[PDB]
Subunit: 93 residues, 4 copies
């Protein structure tokens, strides 16, 4: 199935670099070719679950060059038969 996965990076860097590491994470996520939405606290991608999990492997390795330590959080909405961003939000927009 197609699912949604919200991704948050919290790097262990001095706060003046915080936003920058996050920008690299967002840019990387945007390269995946999947529908995505940047929010105030996370970035949500919509796509096939196993592909996203593989992309998350690449994202973590990529982020090492910018931050030696970071928290990476995934919030997955897993639904048999699929769930999309629009099904979750369109009613409130």
């Amino acid at each position: 199935p197609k699912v949604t996965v919200s991704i948050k990076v919290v790097p262990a860097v001095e706060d003046g670099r915080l936003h920058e590491v996050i920008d690299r994470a967002i840019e990387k996520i945007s390269s995946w070719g999947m529908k995505y939405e940047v929010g105030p606290s996370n970035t949500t991608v919509e796509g096939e679950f196993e592909e996203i999990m593989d992309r998350v492997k690449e994202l973590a390795r990529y982020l090492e060059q910018f931050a030696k330590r970071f928290v990476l959080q995934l919030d997955i909405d897993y639904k048999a038969g699929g769930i999309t961003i629009e099904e979750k939000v369109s009613k409130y927009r």
Copy 2:
């Protein structure tokens, strides 16, 4: 100084009724008078920290009439001197 607080409610109810509990939470959050944004995974409010914490107390009691069991998650971005939704997202918008 403001903070952002992203709020996620995950009720223990059959999938068919998920959307209803969430609707009520979003409706209640919209009543607070604070700037807010509904995302696919959470709803983010911007405002004064202690007031938001008091509003969260009210939200949880309110939700109990719709779901007897739920997960409530707050992701708070706390910055001395304040932080806003725009400072976090506007460059992607």
Copy 3:
């Protein structure tokens, strides 16, 4: 009478080498609340009355700003009408 559990995670925007002092102060502060608590690898879980914990969280945030000008603070609340406890969720495994 009804309790909730609330797991608390602090992630400070400080260099890796200072992460642990902020977290230590957070844990020390949580332990002063008098509530049953358990420190885990990723968070610290308290069991107690919901509104009291929310008020303690207000104090926690103010307290922590001395040690870190910017931090993420995450709460994961298990809310159950009539109450839920740590033991009801983990005793099976311990």
Copy 4:
């Protein structure tokens, strides 16, 4: 180098079925052979990042037989050179 990954499952089922789905998840996690710790809110594994991400793919598919909709949350502590459960908790135990 290891990471720690804290896993939370929140199924969209009635409250009476909730702890059961979670037990199935914990049992499956225990089959991975990795050091793990069950807590009140999540179960933390320590091991190699990419292997854990592949086990998470299997976990989601497995859980589908019990709950057709669920939230699955990963909180990953990622450190250059590795990080362990003991490094994170042993000071407070």
